Write a protein that binds this DNA or RNA. Structure first.
Lengths: 343, 121, 78, 46
RNA sequence: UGGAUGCGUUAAAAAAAAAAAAAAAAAAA
RNA sequence: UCAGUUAGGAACGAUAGUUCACCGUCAGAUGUAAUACGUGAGCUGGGUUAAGAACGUCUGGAGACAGUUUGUUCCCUAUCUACCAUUUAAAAAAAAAAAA
RNA sequence: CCUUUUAAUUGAUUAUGCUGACUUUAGUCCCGAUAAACUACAGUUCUGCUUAAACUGAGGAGUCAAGUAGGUACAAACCGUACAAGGAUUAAUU
RNA sequence: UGCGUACAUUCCUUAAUAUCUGGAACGAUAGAUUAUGAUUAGGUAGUGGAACAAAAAAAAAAAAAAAA
RNA sequence: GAGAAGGGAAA
RNA sequence: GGACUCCUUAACUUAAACUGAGGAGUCAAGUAGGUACAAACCGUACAAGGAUUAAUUAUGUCCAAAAAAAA
RNA sequence: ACACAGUCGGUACGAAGUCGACAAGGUAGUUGAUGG
RNA sequence: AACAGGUGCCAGGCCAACAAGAAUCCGAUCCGUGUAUUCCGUAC
């Protein structure tokens, strides 16, 4: 290796990383991160995401605690769980996966409803929202200490970025995580999620155990352990508004996407217009200078957040629709079939 | 046990590390915490009293009447406002505190029977 | 020589973060950079995996159709 | 100890409620049944 | 066409010197 | 003898388990004391204080001697303090979404 | 519930306690002796050591162990494997 | 000629079991708790009194106001 | 004005 | 078959938190204050419990640290 | 965290307004106490 | 209340070849051998 590479330390620095310095520097960093945002100067509404299943579970348990009875009970009372009991007192409520399914259903319904709402182009929604999947893999022969490294690598990344990350490491036991990621991506694509805007939002490690083997030594017998762990990953499909605000406004673009763009330009698989088309996302320098240009246009009030968002969304959707139509046409399908596919 | 287990676990809330949930360590930490509380609750009265005393002394010195003379004057005048009340008047009722200082001076600075004028002889 | 006491959870967490940064900046960043630079060449084709692998190819896919301005597929011939 | 305290708390939570079932009572099912039989005992021949 | 070391050669002067890692009227980042 | 703004320095051997010493050479500058008689988780193990064995001596003996001898496994992958080395940064991992 | 009783052997921060689980040391110690190629027009890499004949009238000069330790698909499976006349006079059939 | 400083059964709430605290008093269908009554209430070994320890068993889990 | 002999430093 | 301070003593090198006697005080088994910092010295109207009132105990009054120097 | 890692305390809104507000001002919603 | 077994869990009267209730009302989400009231059988 370089032998002069700068290796980072999160707790100490030559420049002075005492706690007061950390406070001041992180105040500066927070200020810069907040100022990096551009916000629309006119919106019609401030819709916020809510989870009906979670709200109903909360109210159900609050009623149980407040009245000592199930909602609707008039004679008997609530019976907490005891040792050996085979009945779940909260069996009527949905499970976590059921709540996730209901969330996906509600997201689909709201997406369909928004297509027939006036002024839908001037509504602020915020960070949270979209569909969520939770995928679990068990029997991984790795320990907490290594799994923490491999998951801290990928947390917060787009799914293809995470797959590229973990594939570059050439570690045999990371094949488990790679299999989980590949299977999750395939499942979401088959269910109809847009792989392009699926991110790894969080992870959870659950121990399962450790198999012990004797190790015979000079004066004692030891026990060497092989771990058994399970990993749960939370994938989230960002809504189109959040995707726009992330990629276009804050310039937080997947490196996999940027690499694909650069490879296309280098191989001349696209026209010369692609350079200006992809300028807002192509490279670090282009992203920085486009962010500067957008900031100046916003401060002169020539930039329009809602119009830019609409243009970005329309271009993305039209590209996807063209892909679908042309892949159908490549099969020799009839005009009636193609038309009916759009209903 | 010296303290009930539930009380121990309730008192060790907010502590660091194993002291929150391990009974062996939580017991020692809770014993020390409650012993400190017991001693300091008995000790804090005089620590508050000295604060009152210092505040009164500064307020009186502002008018050139140190705490010693002020206290003698009030007690001699049959004014039995306590130290906390005097400090409160000093920090929140300056006019009334100045009136108290004036009353104290009127008794402290008594005059001898005969006064001598020696400015021109 | 042996430890005189048990290392605490706080310090173990600190060590986790420090070792993460060490391994990151020493191995993982470099490996990822090399992996992403290798994309400018056709993928490696192992002659010992011929019996089961796909035929050799040079094309590398564009994996974000929403950003593709060109054609995705050609019309069926006749 | 902790196990005895937990078992006593659970028994105190369930034992006072009429009409429970075996799946609700778990390990306390025979004790609950005997308790209800004793409570009924007073109704015999009114 | 060269490398290291001393068994080889040179110096034994400067200390407000050689040198360094935090320009600081910025008093609540 | 007294005195410092305390400045530069004082070599090697025979017998010997030795320290302190004796003797020999060089030099012509005995130095002294403390630091757990500094320092064995840094080294050696010659003396010395286990099992074997021998001489002198004491008892009736097994045995013994602040008498003499010969032989006899010197462990530890350093957690903390200390010290010597050593260290991009505001950022160049991830995240940090306001106003109403 | 309350009441009365119970011989429950009835209250565990501690016996280098017992039976176990799970942390710290730590992602630290631990990795045995020599290795290459398998090819866009022929071939014979290098090294350590030397009983590697398997009918020539001769069971091929031993014992013992593997309670079947060199069979078989890149298998720590399934299946198969010790024939004292050695069965293929199989120079056959095609 | 002063002042600082430790101590409240001043206020409020509890407790006293090897025969002497009023109490041999006032009540009494099973003691409600003393308002300027007294002594008072640090404590190892030792000794003593009391309150718990969510359970089980028992042939006593509806004569109980108002509502239903 | 004192083992003021914890530190500063006072007539 | 305890420790230290004090008074009076025997032994000791008129030595030792030395040894051994006769009496008081604390500790032992007694918190919080002073005496610079882990019993034995000083002091207590000695600690059932709670509280943002008060008192000249020892002992202080330049600062660390509460507490005097009008005209 | 200086801390056997605890304990006792712990920030006192608005005037951030203004077509404001006894004796003098030289009009500042400024000022009155003070010769050796 | 030991008027045993089984029946989705606590049943004298649902089954169990010889007695007697598909008894009624009330039950968060299914069921009830459960609560309350009542009738019947028993030399079991």
């Amino acid at each position: 290796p370089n032998t002069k590479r700068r290796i980072r330390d999160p707790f100490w620095r030559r420049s002075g990383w005492w706690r007061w310095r950390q406070q001041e520097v992180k105040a500066m960093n927070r200020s810069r991160a907040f100022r990096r945002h551009l916000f629309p100067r006119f919106t019609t509404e401030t819709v916020s995401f809510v989870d009906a299943a979670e709200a109903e579970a909360k109210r159900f348990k609050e009623i149980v605690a407040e009245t000592g009875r199930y909602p609707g009970q008039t004679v008997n009372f609530f019976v907490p769980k005891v040792e050996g009991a085979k009945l779940d007192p909260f069996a009527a409520l949905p499970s976590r996966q059921k709540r996730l399914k209901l969330r996906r259903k509600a997201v689909r319904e709201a997406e369909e409803a928004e297509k027939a709402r006036e002024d839908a182009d001037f509504v602020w929604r915020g960070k949270g929202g979209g569909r969520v999947w939770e995928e679990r893999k068990a029997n991984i022969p790795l320990g907490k200490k290594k799994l923490l490294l491999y998951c801290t690598i990928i947390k917060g990344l787009q799914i293809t970025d995470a797959i590229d990350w973990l594939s570059s490491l050439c570690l045999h036991r990371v094949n488990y995580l790679l299999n989980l990621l590949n299977a999750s991506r395939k499942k979401i694509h088959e269910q109809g999620g847009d792989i392009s805007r699926v991110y790894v939002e969080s992870y959870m490690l659950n121990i399962q155990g450790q198999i012990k083997r004797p190790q015979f030594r000079l004066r004692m017998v030891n026990l060497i352990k092989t771990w058994k762990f399970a990993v749960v990953l939370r994938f989230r499909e960002y809504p189109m508004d959040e995707y726009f605000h992330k990629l276009f406004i804050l310039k937080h673009v997947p490196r996999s996407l940027t690499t694909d763009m650069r490879l296309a330009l280098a191989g001349q698989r696209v026209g010369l217009h692609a350079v200006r088309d992809w300028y807002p996302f192509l490279d670090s320098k282009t992203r920085f200078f486009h962010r500067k240009r957008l900031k100046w246009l916003d401060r002169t009030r020539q930039f329009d957040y809602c119009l830019a968002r609409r243009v970005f969304k329309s271009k993305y959707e039209e590209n996807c629709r063209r892909r679908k139509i042309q892949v159908l046409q490549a099969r020799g399908a009839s005009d009636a079939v193609i038309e009916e596919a759009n209903l | 046990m010296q303290i009930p287990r539930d009380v121990i676990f309730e008192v060790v809330r907010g502590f660091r590390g194993r002291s929150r949930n391990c009974i062996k360590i939580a017991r020692v930490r809770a014993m020390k915490a409650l012993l400190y509380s017991s001693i300091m609750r008995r000790q804090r009265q005089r620590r508050y009293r000295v604060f009152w005393i210092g505040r009164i002394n500064a307020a009186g010195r502002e008018w050139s009447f140190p705490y010693a003379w002020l206290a003698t004057s009030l007690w001699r005048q049959n004014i039995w406002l306590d130290r906390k009340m005097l400090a409160n008047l000093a920090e929140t009722e300056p006019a009334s505190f100045r009136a108290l200082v004036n009353e104290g001076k009127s008794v402290y600075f008594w005059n001898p029977d005969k006064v001598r004028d020696i400015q021109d002889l | 020589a042996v430890p005189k006491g048990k290392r605490s959870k706080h310090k173990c967490k600190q060590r986790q973060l420090i070792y993460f940064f060490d391994q990151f900046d020493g191995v993982f960043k470099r490996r990822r950079e090399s992996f992403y630079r290798s994309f400018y060449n056709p993928p490696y084709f192992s002659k010992q995996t011929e019996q089961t692998s796909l035929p050799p190819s040079v094309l590398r896919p564009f994996r974000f159709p929403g950003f593709w301005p060109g054609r995705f597929a050609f019309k069926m011939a006749s | 100890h902790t196990e005895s305290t937990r078992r006593k708390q659970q028994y105190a939570s369930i034992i006072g409620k009429q009409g429970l079932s075996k799946k609700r009572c778990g390990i306390h099912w025979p004790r609950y049944r005997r308790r209800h039989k004793a409570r009924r005992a007073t109704k015999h021949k009114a």
